């Protein structure tokens, strides 16, 4: 025994199928710990979660804990080099991040498995003696102000904060968590607060070992991992902080029976119905909140959603419990609104209470709870192996909530059925304690109020007594049934043994004109699951905007009517993904392989025989029109990427083209479109998982067979199977296209340096440079220069071509950004000229580990395969060859490559830039001198004006 370890944990109950090894323990200083031994993980990781967050922010420095979280990255006592942490991880294949919630601050990284000790050390420092450097402070406040800027114009954020501001103002729930330049610098200097000191005050006052939980995952044996923690974490001061409670609800008497009418930024139509509840956390083992959310939120036959959709009022509904803090929670039912529904809100709400009435009126259904228990049991048994970074972070978070033995199980397994709790909570959901909110453009100019932080335009009203009274008397309504028994529960979990000639990569087990079929039997994960992917090709999916519009609408309407049936299957771990592409349709079925054939069949059947409902079509069209219009309000950086895809792709219809070609889409024209669409196809498919060559062929045949019979589908000519090309930029060219964002007062910019077609050598030149410049880019342009919160670099891949991209969202104009990125590029050339021999070999090694990181779940592997497939390159052994070639690459090579391709005066520099200007608009290293750019005036003229690349060769 060790007096540095208050206690060791016994078995950590894990999934039967879980090959990782677990030991939890409580350290002497009070810290809870979980150790995970996975002898074969090639990324190790750790997280720590402090049970403190912005709900504890000083009333007069809003944002302190978010800000603190940003700061702990920027240097410590033994690692005072500002970017030592993030540079280390860059050089050793790791990545890192953090988040701050009401009651939590969570920090996590991953790294190449040998470099665990090193990364973990630097990490452990954040919680011992962070520098809180004074000039790092003044800079990093801008990143926070930038985080907030980004969200000011976001509808979910405005609403998130509007709730806080409509409950008790004295309650710490009203607090503004993010902080910004004002709260974190300005109001402080005015009030003569010293902010560095407050960071220390707070860090010392609250980052106590008794409020911490730590999770670490490596190859190291459980005993080694124990040493490693104790060596690095026993040293954390235990200030014995009491953990905050908020036993009073933010919503009190006066805050109920209220109605809020709110102007959104987007053109969205929403109803937010919300009830206050006691903290249901403690009842976690019976979980009455989940039970009720499951019925209220049900989508199948007889469900509340189903009736509201039938009256053509709402399309989607979410319900169930929402977290609050220790001491309080919420129960929510939220719907969107058709133009009709918006006119019918009082009614929709009555219908909610009607449903609630049905439930009250026949009380807690054990069969239901039992179904839920059983399903969780299975979900848990066959859980996919998580990625380390996510797993450590997740775990470290729930370590504060469940005994060490039951962390792995708590959030999955339900236990005993508690009718009394079910009824306790249910009894809390009645007209007298309701808050109602409506979100509509129709309140424009009719609101008398402004939320102070987001500026949200709104109006408040007591809900008249006549209206509450009328909901209290809600009767029963024959249209509301409990769900029926879940037909889809998987039962057959047998893992079919690996076939005699089963291959390591996907085999091409079929090649007719009508279909190309790729198959691989799962040889790694042995879980009762399969992935079934399918590109369908038709010229008519994308021939013109009117036709894109119809392709899209067809699949939406299809999905919309399949929904009641598919929901059940979803709950039972069987799901589908169906959407239109530029080449045709994509369809994917993932999950337990057992009922997979039933669902697939129903889809193809339901699709080749689909009849449209008048009302649905009208409703979905109106939603899709808004959707297209709503792009106006997306983030500047997203706009930049959007225009770049438009500029660089051979054919690509624009949201504008689509929006105005949509009035033309009529019911008749759609009916005509579908058999027209289905009449001629090619199918490409990957079927990866727990099935056999014969089963696979069988599944394919079944798919084909249904199309031939219901849709009269016959094959496509090889010649008509066309990929799109990328525009070929001239040697030494510089084009800039530029637009204004009408919503966000912040600008955006993508810069594209195009290099050449993908090939083993070109791929790897690009990827290595991207790797070398990766953290430097972030460091100079964000940490140092503070251009904005969003700063990104690294590779662009499309239509078989590639190159280097930079993305930045910022307060500065693009004309300015351009120079700084350019300036940075020189700094980066000198940096490599000088960089040490094995500094370089570290970067090769870091790239290598990234690329050869093995998939941890089936679907991770399937994506890797699909990538090769839909991209037409079919290069399944890619990583091994490209990494083997990565290694003979010399610092020499990278320089010639930079000089030839990317340098401002490279003979072969191909450059395009998209400048999205803020709502408003028109020291440092040496920026170079830049040519007059050609100013793209018209993307059609642009594209017509230059060559197109070849398409890439298959393998």
């Amino acid at each position: 025994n060790n007096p540095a370890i208050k206690r060791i944990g016994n078995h950590i109950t894990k999934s039967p199928e879980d090959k990782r090894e677990y030991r939890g323990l409580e350290l002497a200083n009070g810290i809870k710990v979980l150790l995970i031994s996975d002898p074969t993980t090639d990324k190790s990781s750790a997280a720590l979660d402090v049970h403190i967050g912005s709900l504890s922010d000083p009333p007069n420095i809003a944002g302190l804990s978010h800000f603190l979280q940003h700061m702990l990255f920027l240097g410590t006592k033994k690692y005072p080099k500002e970017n030592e942490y993030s540079q280390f991880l860059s050089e050793h294949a790791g990545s890192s991040n953090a988040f701050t919630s009401g009651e939590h601050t969570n920090y996590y990284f991953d790294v190449s498995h040998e470099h665990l000790e090193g990364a973990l050390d630097r990490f452990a420092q954040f919680f011992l003696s962070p520098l809180f450097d004074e000039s790092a402070k003044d800079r990093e406040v801008n990143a926070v102000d930038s985080e907030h800027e980004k969200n000011v114009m976001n509808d979910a954020w405005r609403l998130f904060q509007l709730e806080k501001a409509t409950g008790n103002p004295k309650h710490p729930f009203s607090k503004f968590g993010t902080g910004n330049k004002y709260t974190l610098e300005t109001r402080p200097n005015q009030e003569g607060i010293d902010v560095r000191q407050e960071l220390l005050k707070f860090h010392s006052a609250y980052y106590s070992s008794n409020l911490m939980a730590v999770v670490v995952l490596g190859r190291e044996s459980l005993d080694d991992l124990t040493n490693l923690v104790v060596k690095l974490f026993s040293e954390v001061e235990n200030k014995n902080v009491p953990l905050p409670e908020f036993p009073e609800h933010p919503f009190q008497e006066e805050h109920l029976k209220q109605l809020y009418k709110i102007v959104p930024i987007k053109d969205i139509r929403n109803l937010y119905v919300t009830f206050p509840i006691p903290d249901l956390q403690k009842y976690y083992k019976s979980n009455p909140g989940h039970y009720l959310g499951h019925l209220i939120g049900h989508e199948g036959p007889g469900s509340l959603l189903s009736e509201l959709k039938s009256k053509g009022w709402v399309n989607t509904l979410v319900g169930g419990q929402k977290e609050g803090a220790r001491g309080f929670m919420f129960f929510i039912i939220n719907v969107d609104l058709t133009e009709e529904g918006l006119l019918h809100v009082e009614d929709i709400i009555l219908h909610m209470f009607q449903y609630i009435q049905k439930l009250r009126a026949e009380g807690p259904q054990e069969w239901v709870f039992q179904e839920l228990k059983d399903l969780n049991a299975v979900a848990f048994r066959f859980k996919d192996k998580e990625r380390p970074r996510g797993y450590t972070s997740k775990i470290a978070g729930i370590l504060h909530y469940y005994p060490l033995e039951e962390v792995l199980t708590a959030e999955y397994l339900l236990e005993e059925f508690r009718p009394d709790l079910i009824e306790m909570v249910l009894d809390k959901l009645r007209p007298e304690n309701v808050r109602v909110a409506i979100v509509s453009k129709s309140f424009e100019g009719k609101t008398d109020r402004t939320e102070e932080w987001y500026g949200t335009q709104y109006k408040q009203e007591a809900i008249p007594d006549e209206v509450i009274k009328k909901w209290q008397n809600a009767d029963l309504n024959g249209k509301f049934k409990l769900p029926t028994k879940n037909e889809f529960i998987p039962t057959n979990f047998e893992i079919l043994p690996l076939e005699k000639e089963a291959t390591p990569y996907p085999a091409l087990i079929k090649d007719t004109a009508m279909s190309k079929l790729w198959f691989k039997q799962d040889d790694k994960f042995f879980l009762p699951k399969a992935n079934l992917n399918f590109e369908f090709f038709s010229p008519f999916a994308y021939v013109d905007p009117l036709h894109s519009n119809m392709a899209y609408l067809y699949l939406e309407l299809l999905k919309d009517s399949l929904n009641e049936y598919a929901y059940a299957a979803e709950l039972a771990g069987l799901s589908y993904d169906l959407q239109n592409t530029i080449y045709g349709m994509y369809l994917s079925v993932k999950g337990y392989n057992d009922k997979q054939p039933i669902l697939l069949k129903k889809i193809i059947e339901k699709m080749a025989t689909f009849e449209i409902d008048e009302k649905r079509f009208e409703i979905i069209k109106e939603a899709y029109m808004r959707s297209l219009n709503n792009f106006r309000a997306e983030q500047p950086h997203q706009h930049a990427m959007y225009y770049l895809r438009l500029l660089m792709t051979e054919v690509a219809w624009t949201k504008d083209e689509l929006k105005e070609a949509l009035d033309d889409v009529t019911l008749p024209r759609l009916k005509a479109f579908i058999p027209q669409l289905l009449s001629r196809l090619h199918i490409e498919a990957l079927l990866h998982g727990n099935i056999t060559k014969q089963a696979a062929l069988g599944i394919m045949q079944m798919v084909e067979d249904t199309l031939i019979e219901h849709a009269h589908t016959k094959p496509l000519l090889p010649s008509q199977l066309v990929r799109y090309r990328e525009v070929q930029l001239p040697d030494r060219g510089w084009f800039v296209y530029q637009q204004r964002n009408e919503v966000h007062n912040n600008s955006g910019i993508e810069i594209y340096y195009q290099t050449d077609m993908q090939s083993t050598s070109e791929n790897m030149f690009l990827e290595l440079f991207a790797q070398i410049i990766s953290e430097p880019a972030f460091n100079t342009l964000r940490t140092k220069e503070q251009l904005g919160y969003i700063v990104f670099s690294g590779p662009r891949r499309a239509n078989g071509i590639q190159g280097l991209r930079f993305i930045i969202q910022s307060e500065k104009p693009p004309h300015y950004l351009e120079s700084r990125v350019e300036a940075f590029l020189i700094t980066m050339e000198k940096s490599i000229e000088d960089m040490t021999e094995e500094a370089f070999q570290k970067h090769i090694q870091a790239l290598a580990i990234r690329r050869l990181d093995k998939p941890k779940k089936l679907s991770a592997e399937s994506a890797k395969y699909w990538g090769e497939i839909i991209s037409q390159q079919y290069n399944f052994d890619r990583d091994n060859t490209e990494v083997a070639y990565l290694k003979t690459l010399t610092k020499e090579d990278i320089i010639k490559f930079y000089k030839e391709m990317l340098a401002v005066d490279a003979p072969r520099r191909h450059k395009v830039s998209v400048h999205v200007l803020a709502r408003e608009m028109d020291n440092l290293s040496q920026a170079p001198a830049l040519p007059q750019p050609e100013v793209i005036q018209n993307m059609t003229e642009f594209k017509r004006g230059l060559p197109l690349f070849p398409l890439v060769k298959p393998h």
């Binding site: 979280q69 991040n97 953090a98 988040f99 499951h294 979410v318």
Partner: peptide, 8 residues
């Protein structure tokens, strides 16, 4: 459906 500040 049943119901479900960073850096980088």
């Amino acid at each position: 459906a049943s119901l479900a500040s960073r850096q980088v």
